[model samples]
Target: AKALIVYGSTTGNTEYTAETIARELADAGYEVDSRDAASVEAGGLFEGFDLVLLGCSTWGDDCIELQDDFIPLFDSLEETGAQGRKVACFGCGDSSYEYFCGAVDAIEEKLKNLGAEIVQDGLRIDGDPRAARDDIVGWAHDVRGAI
Candidate 1:
């Protein structure tokens, strides 16, 4: 099996979560290519992967915004060959925020519109992902089965 994980993180929480998920997938015998969105290209990025995982920390208080490094990648997501692909999104956000994990919502919506099969419900961490480590792991496990 193969998987792709791309993440954009400012406070490093989302990055940590991405790494954790990647580890879980690897443990299940997947050849995972985990990447920072800042350095990843959008073109055919999902090709040859059985699953695609996206993680981006939310920014802004009143309105939701994707983490800076993920913006360009998000904008060009259609070029990633997501059509009919299996994809899932996860992210860290504060519960106090008006749009908690909005970036995850946005990504999933886009993937859905592009005809990607959403393999699992998104993982939205209320605060530091380290505090919600079990939830993330469990979610990854479920996603692994879904694939």
Candidate 2:
């Protein structure tokens, strides 16, 4: 299967998580195209892919804010050909924050609004993703099965 993983990270945790998910997908025999959100265009971003994975770090204390690089894509996600497409979201954030991993929630909601099929529950890491490695791998495995 073809999979696309796009991530926006400021401190690199989300990027690391995306890479880990990409490796797991590749090991599972998927053709994966992993990209940095800063380098990707939201327009038709999911075209030609069987599955799309979005990752972004959460910011803001009172409200939810997606990582800087992901803002543009998030704003224009309606043009990404997401309708009827299989999609999933993941993100990293401190649980102490009121809006912990809120970016993931926001993205999933937007995808749903665009008619994308959510194949699995979002992976929201509370701390360092490397420490939550098993969760990441397990989530990817679940996504693989869902496809």
Candidate 3:
């Protein structure tokens, strides 16, 4: 299945997660694309893609403010009948804060509400990321299989 790894990051941790997932997806023989959330227009995003994986860093109070268009993008996807499409998520945050991986929670809920089938549990990360490498690798392979 065609796949995408999209992300929003402040200090690059989320981006790193996206890249790693994309790499594993590629290695597993799926066509994969990776992009920065701030740079992508959600329209046409699901086109040619059977699976879409999103990653982002927490912003504030469990809200994805910088990812402004994303939640609405999934809403539109639902309205457009792409809602049942496959989607997955991962994100990074400060564990010291109460809102760890808030963006992932919000995104996952939005996608689920929109009718997308998530392939696996969304991976949440502390700002420190050594652990995410292995987790993302396993998650990507799992998505590849699930799709």
Candidate 4:
């Protein structure tokens, strides 16, 4: 599967997760592409890729500001019959927030409605995700295995 890891990060947490996953995927013999969500235009994506990973951080309990570009782009993908592509998600958030990592949940909902195949249970990390690197790596491998 052609795996793409895209992230939206205002504080670098999300980007860190994406980098880790991309490196793991590459090391595992999969062709991987990692990009910042803000920079990715959502055009010409999903053309040949079967798996996609989206990363983001929660903003104000319910939204992911950095992910502004992805919603519409994913909507376009679904409208164009790009459903059935395997997908996964991860994010970081402050545990003090009532909705820790809610952004990941929202993305999951969007992906589900668009008929994207979920690869695993989405990951939500509080504070620094670096501490959870090993677990995240396991999750990534598990997701790929599922697809």
Candidate 5:
């Protein structure tokens, strides 16, 4: 199976989580193409992948804002060939914030609106993902099983 993982992180939390998920997917026999959202083009980005994983941390005090690098892709997601594609979203954010991991929620909603099949519930980490390593691994396992 082939999988695509795209992430945007300023504090590196989401990036670390993405890498962990990518490694888990790879170990499960998937050919994973993990990328930074800043470097990926939005158009047809999901083509040829059996699954797509999007990770981006939330920012802003009272509103939902996707990580800087992820905003463009989020804006043009409809062009990513997401229609009927299998996809999932994950992110890291502090629970103290009003919209804890709101970016994940937003992305999942967008993907669903674009007709992407959500394979699993989004993984929203409310703090350092390294501290929640088990959760991340479990989520990845669930996604792998779905595949």
Candidate 6:
């Protein structure tokens, strides 16, 4: 099977999370294609992948602002052929913020509205993702089984 991972990261937290998820899925026999969101096109993004993982760190203290690069892809999500796709979300954020890891929620909600099958609840990492490495591993394992 194959999986696709697209992540938008600024402080390198979400990027690290993306790589960890990719490795975990790879060990489970998936051909993983992980890319930075800034380097990817939204069109047919999930077309042929068995599973899709979207990660983006949230910004701002009072509201949900998805990571910069992710905004373009998010705006063009409908063009990604996400309907009926197996998808999951993750993100890094600060707990001090009111909307901690809000990007995960936003992506999940959008994917749901687009008819995507949400394989698991999103992984929202507060602070350094490395501190919660176990969480990422568990989430990746769960989503792999789902696809």
In model 5, which range of ten residues has the least summed lDDT?
A: 138-147
Question: Candidate 3 lDDT, tens digit per residue, 1-147?
Answer: 678777777777777888888878788788888877666776767767888888877766644453443444544544433477888888887777777777788778877887888988888887666665887788777777776
Question: For residues 1-147, could you state the per-residue lDDT of candidate 6 as single tens digits?
Answer: 888999999989999999999999889878999999998998988999888999999997777899998999999999999999989999999888888888899999999999999999999999998999999999998887776
Q: Which segments of candidate 6 are over 4 A away from where they belong?
A: none
- What 10-residue stretch in candidate 2 is worst by lDDT? 37-46
Candidate scoring better on TM-score of 5 and 6: 5
Residue 123 lDDT in candidate 4: 80
Task: Kindly give the stretch of ten consecutive residues in candidate 4 with the minimal lDDT sum.
Answer: 73-82
TM-score of each: 0.98, 0.98, 0.84, 0.86, 0.98, 0.97
**Residue by residue across 78-102, what tens digits does model 2's lDDT show?**
9999999999999999999988899
Angstrom error of the Cα, residue 90, model 5: value is 0.4
Candidate 2 clashing pairs, residues 3+ apart or interchain: none
What digit string (tens of lDDT, one per residue) describes model 5 on residues 1-147? 999999999989999999999999989899999999999999899999999999999999689889999999999999999998999999999999999898999999999999999999999998889899999999999998876
TM-score of 1: 0.98
| Model 5 regions lying over 4 Å from their true place | none
lDDT of 1 at 81: 95
lDDT of 2 at 140: 96
Clashes of 1: 0
